[PDB]
Design a protein around this ligand. Sequence first.
Ligand SMILES: [Cu+2]
Length: 599
Amino acid sequence: KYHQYKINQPEYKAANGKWEIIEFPEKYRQNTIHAALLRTGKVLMVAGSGNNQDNSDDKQYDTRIWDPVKGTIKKVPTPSDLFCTGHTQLANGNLLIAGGTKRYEKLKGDVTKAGGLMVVHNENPDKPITLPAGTKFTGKENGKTFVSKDPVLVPRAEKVRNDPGLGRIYVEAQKSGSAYETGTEDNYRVQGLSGADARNTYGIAQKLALDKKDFQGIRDAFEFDPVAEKYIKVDPMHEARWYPTLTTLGDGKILSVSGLDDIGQLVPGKNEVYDPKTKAWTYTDKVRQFPTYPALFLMQNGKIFYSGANAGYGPDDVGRTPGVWDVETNKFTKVPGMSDANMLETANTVLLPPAQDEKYMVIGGGGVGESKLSSEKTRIADLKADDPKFVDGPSLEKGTRYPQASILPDDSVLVSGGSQDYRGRGDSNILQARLYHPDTNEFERVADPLVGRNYHSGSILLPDGRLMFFGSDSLYADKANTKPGKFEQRIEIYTPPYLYRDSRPDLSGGPQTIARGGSGTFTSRAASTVKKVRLIRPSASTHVTDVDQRSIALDFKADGDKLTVTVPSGKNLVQSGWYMMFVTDGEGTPSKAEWVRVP
Ligand SMILES: [Cu+2]
């Protein structure tokens, strides 16, 4: 339009950057749900079956590697249905990817009525129990009632605790509409049982709502080798997990937390650790339950910070409170102050730059399950404070689920997209982007994104300083919510303001390996202009969750055209692995990254 003229003016791009749509040849398209920047500089894009029933039925599983410099894309053979998986970079630079989705069950019953899977428990070792069709289950907390359509046989408990018999049955609300939906797990009383039967028999269900498909986890785990460009099978997890968080501990092992299991129950706090040297998994000694994709970050004291951000599931009163988790002792200490604590599902979490400060920001979020509630708020916790607590930061304009959030090499945080309602319901994509500035605690609006991104989206900082945005899985295609949504297969590249100004500093000397506490030397003719150096861990982003990205400040010295940088000593700050190293000048303009390996 004229718009298009406005947003291409030198002054405009200099203050707001600019967006571009990339669309791939039809043959390379997929529903990208997970992405990660690899140490090769290319982006792993993982769809699995892509939340597509035909692909699940055909075992059609997709992965791409996309080269942002050349703009080329290739397919990668994908061994398991690796969407709704967990993932993080290993010390060797491989991406550990574990969990994912079992072949999906057909959705049954009336599309206008809340329902889903009820898992019936039988505590009686003496006898099985059959609940006939039309059995009513009522939530002990939520008070809502659902009815089975078919009989279910629930086998005897087995003695060992008795281990309860379990039987799965579809249940459905009596009347249509969202008034009769639930958003969290509850324990359901079975109406019309008396005595012993009532004592030994009960239901557990996750959300029983209108986006109805029932998903189960798988145990498979792989290392993605970015040099070979292949998935390498490693030992499977002990637990099947759909939506686990994988997060690096102090000793370099990977902790896997939560997820739904092979029958769709929340894994009840049975966490496990991958040792990259043995390529084997071990249960943790002690149990702690969280909802799915919990946002879990390694702190400099070796404990885990849980921000409260999560993708849902489980009860509303277990693992819903932000805090500090000592994995070895299992002590959990609440961090108070969170505003809109009822709107933490589908929020983003960022460890603010520089990571040395241990400040976490929680952005946006929505009510449990398919709630119409959404939060405009940011909330910041400083974990180095005497009494740590969340305090509100700058607000967004609109309540926003699913905001994308990426650390930039200038210490800004790009916060972009999202939607006002569940899965972009009511055509509620928010086509806005901001820079968050940590030092001022201010938001600055920048250019609007071109493509809406809600559920199943993400963003990835690239070595050249641009950012890639992917995904978006709207429930509906139309504002009226009458037709099924189509998965967004375009990506965008966002060029920030800092690339529309003066010449950027030059940098060469990579790739290099630099130990914690060690130093390395790089070349920059513009060394004298460098104000900061940042070692930035590449992102692995899914479901509004990225426990990989962090930006570590490096001390440096300039000596003519030579920059000597020093890596901090702590293994809890500087996780082993590969990092982008950016140098930024006093005008805030970053170099392109060189890659550095920390052993
Ligand atoms: Cu998902």
